[PDB]
Ligand binder design. Structure first.
Ligand SMILES: O=C(O)CSc1cccnc1C(=O)O
Ligand SMILES: [Mn+2]
Ligand SMILES: [Mn+2]
Ligand code: NA
Length: 619
């Protein structure tokens, strides 16, 4: 109903039908069309025709370039103001701040950014009214997980960005089948605008619409809403990637008895024809995608990839921890990707791939720092800033956060159960960080409670202090930027799994690929040689007597690690445990958990801190 002609948006639909949508999906679409005032509404069907036509359209408006060296590959170069997730403009709205972050004892919370309902309503009203004027509102119906999966969740993303539509087609399962599957079911409401209504009030840079000053990425878990304004980039705009996958899903997980985690999932098969699935949580620049797609050096071993970023895991009636990758694609960091570091990624990204902020070769190929591949005499480079570039030039040819966005189905070692609706049974969970000193190559937690403590205690060398100097920062569970709710309550949720009847608790490990000697040289060759550490984990899960007790947990026995063909590895330095180092380490973990988790620190985590202190004290 209406007394005039401004509420019914049927006449503006250029694909699909408002009439055909489920009731609550129509209310979401039409209500936001009323608010945002798009010129057109395009209900996405997910078809190849739709996708090809949208790429060709972006190519027409100079938003993307075709990469002529490859099969159906594309390049977007952004406004340099819009190149990454912005944590300081990423917020969660709850009635009480304590539900979102623990109230710290002394300092500012680094475990999330709470925004009041009141501040959000004012921020929303200052951004969204009229924000899509002159633009198409695309309606993206998407599944996080295989369409039928009991572990899958559905979203609807409204966006004014064709780049988001194309990228969501790769990274999620989207289109008409999702609407038909959803019916009158619950879904996560995802609203996105680049925040540049036409006619443009400000200059358009590099054909990349964004509003850096008003950039705000908001999560309202109580309303099942994600509302993102002003960035067209990655984790700010692809609302499945982090906003749904980790922040909303971790809150749903808490409510519903499951886990939404920043973990790769891989399947590993040994020479005895036994296969196990492992999950691993690493912070930035620690090589998750490299591990998830490992080419093992050990003969008779096979690694296969289920996912490189997000794991949704739920203990089933039988007690198995069943995990799905809720994504449909890999959104990998391009720099440092080489035939040496990740040959399977190199194979994956040569067709049907969208690249963002990488360099382009004159023959229509891609380039970045660490590609570790020479160009034939004659081949020149255009930087990600669309300027001629030479290897001696002092700025990088690719943005350090530049990306490939590639279908998961194209990975030559994609696991045959990567889309199984039941998920895969997780037998080990691996935590890890970049630690140039003190921390052994691998250790195993003494118990589930010790393992949750090891997660909570994760630290990693930052890319910088942000002028020259290193910082060792805390990144518990690799979730510091991604917690959907109070981290103390998340620790309690993890600890509660031990009390779930029938639960088969996976073995917990911690790895450090990055330990250095006195001269700053890596003690471990890494890459495919990491298969030797996975072999040790595999045997430990089978109950092999291959461990020695230390104050930090179990490490490999003398002669337990397969070092056949590495020549002389310095195992003594690589597994060295210094009382002085670990006294300092437990003090930093104590100060951190006391301040940042404070009243919400579970008893069992404090007990694990006391126990580690006591074991170090007896060295
Ligand atoms: O900065 C961005 O928008 C992307 S951040 C990202 C992308 C893919 C997978 N993981 C991450 C992450 O920040 O952990
Ligand atoms: Mn046009
Ligand atoms: Mn990630
Ligand atoms: Na551009």
């Amino acid at each position: 109903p209406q007394l005039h002609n401004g509420l019914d948006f049927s006449a503006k639909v250029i694909q699909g039908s408002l009439d055909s949508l489920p009731q609550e999906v129509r209310k979401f679409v039409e209500g936001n069309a009323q608010l945002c005032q798009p010129e057109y509404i395009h209900i996405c069907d997910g078809s190849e025709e739709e996708y090809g036509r949208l790429l060709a359209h972006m190519q027409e408006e100079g938003v993307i370039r075709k990469l002529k060296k490859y099969d159906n590959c594309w390049l977007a170069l952004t406004d340099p103001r819009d190149v990454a997730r912005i944590e300081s403009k990423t917020v969660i709205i709850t009635q009480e701040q304590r539900d979102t972050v623990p109230i710290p004892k002394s300092g500012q919370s680094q475990l999330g950014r709470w925004m009041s309902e009141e501040d959000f309503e004012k921020a929303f009203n200052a951004r969204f009214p009229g924000c899509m004027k002159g633009r198409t509102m695309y309606v993206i119906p998407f599944s996080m997980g295989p369409l039928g999966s009991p572990l899958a969740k559905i979203g609807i993303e409204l966006t004014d960005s064709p780049y988001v539509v194309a990228s969501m087609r790769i990274m999620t399962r989207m289109g008409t089948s999702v609407l038909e599957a959803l019916g009158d079911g619950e879904f996560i409401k995802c609203l996105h605008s680049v925040g540049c209504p036409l006619p443009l009030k400000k200059p358009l840079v590099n054909n990349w619409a964004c509003n850096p000053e008003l950039t705000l990425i908001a999560h309202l878990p109580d309303r099942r809403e994600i509302i993102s304004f002003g960035s067209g980039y990655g984790g700010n705009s692809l609302l499945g990637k982090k906003c749904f996958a980790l922040r909303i899903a971790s809150r749903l997980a808490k409510e519903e008895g499951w886990l939404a985690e920043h973990m790769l999932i891989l399947g590993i098969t040994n020479p005895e024809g036994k296969k196990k699935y492992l999950a691993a949580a690493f912070p930035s620049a620690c090589g998750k995608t490299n591990l998830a797609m490992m080419n093992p050096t050990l003969p008779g071993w096979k690694v296969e990839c289920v996912g490189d970023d997000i794991a949704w895991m739920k203990f089933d009636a039988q007690g198995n921890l069943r995990a799905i990758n809720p994504e449909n694609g890999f959104f990998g960091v391009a720099p440092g990707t080489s035939v040496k570091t990740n040959p399977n990624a190199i194979k994956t990204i040569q067709k049907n791939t969208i690249f963002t902020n990488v360099a382009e070769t004159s023959d229509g190929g891609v380039y970045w720092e660490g590609i570790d591949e020479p160009l034939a005499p004659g081949v020149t480079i255009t930087s990600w800033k669309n300027k001629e570039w030479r290897p001696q030039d002092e700025e990088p040819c690719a943005h350090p956060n530049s990306r490939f966005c590639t279908p998961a189905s194209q990975c030559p070692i994609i696991d045959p159960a990567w889309e199984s609706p039941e998920g895969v049974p997780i037998e080990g969970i691996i935590f890890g960080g970049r630690r140039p000193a003190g921390v052994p190559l691998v250790y195993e937690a003494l118990s589930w409670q010790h393992g949750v403590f090891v997660g909570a205690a994760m630290r990693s060398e930052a890319t910088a202090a942000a002028h020259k100097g290193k910082v060792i920062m805390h990144d518990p569970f690799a979730m510091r930027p991604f917690f959907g709710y109070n981290f103390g309550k998340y620790l309690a949720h993890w600890l509660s799994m031990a009390h779930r009847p029938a639960a088969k608790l996976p073995k917990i490990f911690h790895v450090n690929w990055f330990r250095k000697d006195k001269n700053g040289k890596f003690l471990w060759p890494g890459f495919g040689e990491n298969s030797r550490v996975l072999e040790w984990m595999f045997g430990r899960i089978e109950g092999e007597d291959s461990a020695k007790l230390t104050p930090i947990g179990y490490v490999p026995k003398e002669d337990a690690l397969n070092l056949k063909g590495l020549g002389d590895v310095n195992v003594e330095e690589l597994f060295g445990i210094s009382k002085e180092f670990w006294e300092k380490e437990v003090e930093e973990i104590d100060k951190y958990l006391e301040d940042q988790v404070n009243a919400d620190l579970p008893y069992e985590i404090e007990r694990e801190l006391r126990a580690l202190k006591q074991r170090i004290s007896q060295m």
